[PDB]
Design a protein around this ligand. Structure first.
Ligand SMILES: NC(=O)c1ccc[n+]([C@@H]2O[C@H](COP(=O)([O-])OP(=O)(O)OC[C@H]3O[C@@H](n4cnc5c(N)ncnc54)[C@H](OP(=O)(O)O)[C@@H]3O)[C@@H](O)[C@H]2O)c1
Ligand SMILES: CCOc1ccc(Br)cc1-c1cc2nc(N)nc(N)c2cc1C
Length: 157
């Protein structure tokens, strides 16, 4: 299975200055739950943003840099390499990866951040005409998690 995993706001902002615009611990828990024991494919910038591979899953980085050889990370140099990766593969970002893969993935696990943030990077437009809502779950709010959010699982029609 090939899936997108993304958090985007009401206007599809995903990033600002190479980091997330929001602090939302519950989204990171969501990411952990979905992708632990599976595979993440990310662009070079996204990788450099996190700074180290995420534990307990396969981390794959897409880059043109032939000098890229980082401990605990597998490197790929083509989109076509994604299709040779075994198991459940999550396209993990950033904007460039999402743009390249939205037409190719089986489904999407989206966290809709129900606010409007300043962004410099965006998830591409999509329409529910093309995507069935497999589930929609409101995120629980508390002292640590104060931005309303909804976890959507969309499956291509
Ligand atoms: N909210 C979210 O769900 C989420 C998730 C992840 C990231 N983000 C945000 O997204 C933003 C980063 O997105 P971005 O588009 O600037 O960067 P990115 O997608 O993370 O990385 C772009 C880099 O990926 C490599 N790449 C992409 N496609 C390639 C291809 N076909 N062949 C070879 N290399 C390829 C290139 O690396 P080289 O230049 O080294 O060749 C390219 O410069 C940040 O703000 C980050 O915080 C948000
Ligand atoms: C690039 C900035 O994003 C982060 C920085 C630190 C940590 Br720790 C996780 C993220 C992060 C959260 C994310 N959340 C969702 N729902 N989806 C993603 N594809 C995603 C990707 C990253 C990389």
């Amino acid at each position: 299975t090939l899936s997108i995993l993304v958090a985007h706001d009401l206007q599809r902002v995903i990033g600002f200055e190479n980091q997330l615009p929001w602090h939302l611990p519950n989204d990171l828990k969501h990411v952990k739950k979905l992708s632990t024991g599976h595979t993440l494919v990310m662009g070079r910038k996204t990788f450099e943003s996190i700074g180290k591979p995420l534990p307990n899953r396969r981390n794959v980085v897409l880059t043109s840099d032939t000098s890229f050889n980082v401990e605990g990370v597998d490197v790929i140099h083509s989109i076509e390499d994604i299709y040779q990766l075994p198991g459940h593969v999550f396209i993990f970002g950033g904007q460039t990866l999402f743009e390249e893969m939205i037409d190719k993935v089986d489904d999407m696990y989206i966290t809709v951040i129900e606010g409007k943030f300043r962004g410099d990077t965006f998830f591409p437009p999509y329409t529910f005409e093309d995507w069935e809502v497999a589930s929609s779950v409101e995120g629980k709010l508390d002292e640590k998690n104060t931005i309303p959010h909804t976890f959507l699982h969309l499956i291509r029609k």
